[PDB]
Specification:
This is part of a larger assembly, with one copy of chain A (about 100 residues), two copies of chain B, one copy of chain D (about 50 residues) and one copy of chain E (about 80 residues).
Chain A (H helix, E strand, L loop, with lengths): L33 H38 L9 H23 L1
Chain B lengths: L11 E6 L5 H14 L4 E4 L5 E4 L3 H15 L4 E3 L7 E4 L7 E4 L6 E8 L2 H9 L8 H12 L3 H5 L1 E5 L6 E5 L8 H20 L11 E9 L9 H18 L2 E14 L4 H10 L3 E7 L6 E6 L8 H8 L5 E2 L2 E7 L15
Parallel strand pairs in B: 9-10
Antiparallel strand pairs in B: 1-3, 1-4, 2-3, 5-11, 6-7, 7-10, 8-9, 11-13, 11-14, 11-15, 12-13
Helix pairs in contact in B: 1-2, 6-7
Chain E lengths: L1 H11 L3 E8 L6 E6 L7 E7 L2 E4 L11 E2 L2 H9 L2
Antiparallel strand pairs in E: 1-2, 2-3, 3-4, 4-5
Classes of the chains: A mainly alpha (about 100), B alpha+beta (about 350), D little secondary structure (about 50), E alpha+beta (about 80).
Function (chain C): Component of the U5 snRNP complex required for pre-mRNA splicing. Binds GTP.
Subcellular location (chain C): Cytoplasm; Nucleus
Family (chain C): Belongs to the TRAFAC class translation factor GTPase superfamily. Classic translation factor GTPase family. EF-G/EF-2 subfamily.
Chain lengths: ~100, ~350, ~50, ~50, ~80
């Protein structure tokens, strides 16, 4: 009749019901560092893309200078030599990785 | 466009007929109920039992009244209500994880990591959209989470489906000759990613707040051997493997109560909330009214009959309303065989 | 966006907003589901209007 | 919260709580600000 | 299970197994759409029950129960067109 305690009706038993509370109830790192290595390679690639953006901005500056010389469209500063200066960047970053591995 | 509702279901109840002779009647009643109640989600489990998802206890009460009386005039057995969970990852994948196509040549490896604080919420609210030019997505991510360029440009898809809180990213180190091949296989690795993220490996549920960044996909021969149906299970399996190695966790939904009680009823509310794993964000007098306003969170799993306890103990005063708020990670460790709880 | 019970729970009323055109009783219409698209042309159902 | 729910009856869910408090003394005017009512002060908003 | 069996079988024949994000009105199972290639005109809709591949005839009403179909018949219908 209440919280699962009691009998449905006191009729039929010699008792009045009246359930009571018990009153005595006891109520008690990363193993594959190649992850970091690949993250570093990816961030180096994104730095390369950042330098490509810088190259495009320099190309816009070159286009403005060419238009000014004509006064006295869109052009590209360097088609492939920027890849060689990027190769220098690869050499420098490889040297940096070698030095860091030497330090560790 | 499908209706965008203001709440999720996150409240589950399992039913079956009182006697098995009337199962078809229960099925018909469930079909009609799914027609009539918009956020009800009737599902059938592998045990054969039928679960129903509703917003709250009053929602399920009215739903079951209709099921018993309106549609299928039978007697049903109703299990105790339970919350609907979700699985997340709290740490980056411990090791790289790879899978192989049944042809055993195309190898795909994945690593995963938890997201930052904002991205899940910003996906759900609409600060980002997949149906956007990549330029806007890249600039938003870079501006808001200080992310770098190519990662921002490599966001492939959200899962499961749009508004999902999982990001498919690819980091293939560039310098990849087979841009055409990778772009060919991307359009049907998306589907495998969605399939995996919809049905979690930890349990048959969705995954939340995890980005599955692709690491390396290698495949030498020509396009005859590139079968989408041959490659999707590989993507699903590698997603599962990376997620498991990422020390997965369980997410639980939490409500947001709003109790309007007089000054003298505050201690009872505080005691109820403390007992029911809830904490009070804000407790201020209500301006212009003699009542006090109490705003608090309480997990869905622990909010069974919170309203009834509150109204009984406060002598009828202190009416409260419970709104689904967000998801919270369960404090335990889901995969820990060392715990042997007593089943009482 | 809605379905409503009849005075007895036997059949439903579809609550619709006619965005364009005209509709007459007995008209033949095709019903498009929640995910019908160019990929999924199988959610269409041809039905009458009673 | 129970299967086998037959012959049960449903009850009124809630009523708007009454905020009337009878006057203590007749000297006061009928319309008077009760000190029990919290002040209308909400300098916590961001409007247009 | 039978799901993995049909998945690997579709892998062997270089088919596609796309899940239709739907539940059948009668059995509630997830419906799947099988397509041979980028061509979409020949697409067979399938739901699975008791390790049996079930299919609906094109243009038939929903209340009509789906009829079963084996692997050889799917190959027979996809290889002659």
């Amino acid at each position: 009749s209440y919280n699962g305690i009691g009998l449905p009706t006191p009729r039929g038993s010699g008792t009045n019901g009246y359930v009571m509370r018990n009153l005595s109830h006891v109520k008690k790192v990363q193993d594959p560092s190649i992850s970091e290595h690949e993250c570093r390679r990816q961030i180096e690639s994104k730095l390369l893309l950042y330098r490509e953006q810088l190259l495009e901005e320099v190309s816009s500056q070159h286009s403005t200078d060419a238009a000014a010389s004509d006064s006295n469209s869109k052009t590209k500063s360097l088609d492939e030599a920027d890849v060689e200066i990027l190769v220098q960047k690869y050499r420098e970053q490889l040297l940096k990785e070698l030095q860091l591995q030497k330090s560790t | 466009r499908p209706i965008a509702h203001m709440s999720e279901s996150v409240f589950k109840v399992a039913v079956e007929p009182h006697n098995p002779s009337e199962l078809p009647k229960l099925l018909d009643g469930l079909r009609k109920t799914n027609k009539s109640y918009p956020l009800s989600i009737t599902k059938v489990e592998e045990s054969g039992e039928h679960t129903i998802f509703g917003t709250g206890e009053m929602y399920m009460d009215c739903l079951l009244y209709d099921l018993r009386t309106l549609y299928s005039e039978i007697e049903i057995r109703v299990s105790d209500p339970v919350a609907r969970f979700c699985e997340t990852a709290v740490d980056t994948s411990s090791i790289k994880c790879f899978s192989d196509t049944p042809n055993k040549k195309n190898r795909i490896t994945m690593v995963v990591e938890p997201l930052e604080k904002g991205i899940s919420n910003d996906i759900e609210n609409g600060k980002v959209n997949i149906n956007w030019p990549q330029k806007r997505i890249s600039e938003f991510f870079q501006k808001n989470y200080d992310w770098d360029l190519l990662a921002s440009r490599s966001i492939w898809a959200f899962g499961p489906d749009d508004r999902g809180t999982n990001i498919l990213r690819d980091d293939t180190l560039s310098t990849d000759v087979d841009k055409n091949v990778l772009n060919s296989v991307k359009e049907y690795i998306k589907q495998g990613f969605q399939w995996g993220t919809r049905e979690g490996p930890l349990c048959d549920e969705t995954i939340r707040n995890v980005n599955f960044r692709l690491m390396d996909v290698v495949l030498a021969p020509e396009q005859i051997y590139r079968g989408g149906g041959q490659i999707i299970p590989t993507a699903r399996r590698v997603c599962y493997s990376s997620f498991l190695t990422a020390s997965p966790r369980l997410m639980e939904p939490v409500y947001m109560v709003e109790v309007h009680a007089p000054a003298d009823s505050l201690p009872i509310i505080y005691d109820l909330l403390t007992r029911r794993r809830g904490h009070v964000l804000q407790d201020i007098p209500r301006p212009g009214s003699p009542l006090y306003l109490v705003r608090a969170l309480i997990p869905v799993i622990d909010s069974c009959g919170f309203e009834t306890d509150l109204r009984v103990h406060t002598q009828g005063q202190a009416m409260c309303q419970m709104v689904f708020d967000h998801w919270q990670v369960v404090p335990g460790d889901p995969l820990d065989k060392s715990i042997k709880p007593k089943p009482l | 966006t809605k379905l409503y019970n009849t005075v007895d729970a036997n059949n439903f009323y579809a609550f619709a907003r006619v965005y364009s055109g005209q509709v007459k009783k007995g008209q033949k219409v095709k019903v498009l589901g929640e995910n019908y698209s160019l990929e999924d042309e199988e959610d269409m159902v041809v039905a009458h209007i009673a | 919260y129970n299967s086998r729910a037959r012959s049960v009856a449903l009850s009124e869910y809630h009523q708007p709580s009454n905020v009337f408090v009878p006057p203590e003394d007749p000297d006061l005017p009928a319309f008077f600000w009760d000190p029990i009512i919290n002040p209308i002060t909400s300098r916590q908003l961001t409007l247009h | 299970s039978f799901r993995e069996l049909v998945e690997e079988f579709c892998a062997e024949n270089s088919l596609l197994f796309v899940p239709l994000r739907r539940s059948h009105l009668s059995t509630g199972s997830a419906l799947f759409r099988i397509s041979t290639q980028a061509s979409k005109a020949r697409g067979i809709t399938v739901y699975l029950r008791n390790d049996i591949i079930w299919k609906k005839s094109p243009g038939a009403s929903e209340d009509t129960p789906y009829d079963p179909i084996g692997f050889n018949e799917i190959l027979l219908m996809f290889n002659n067109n």
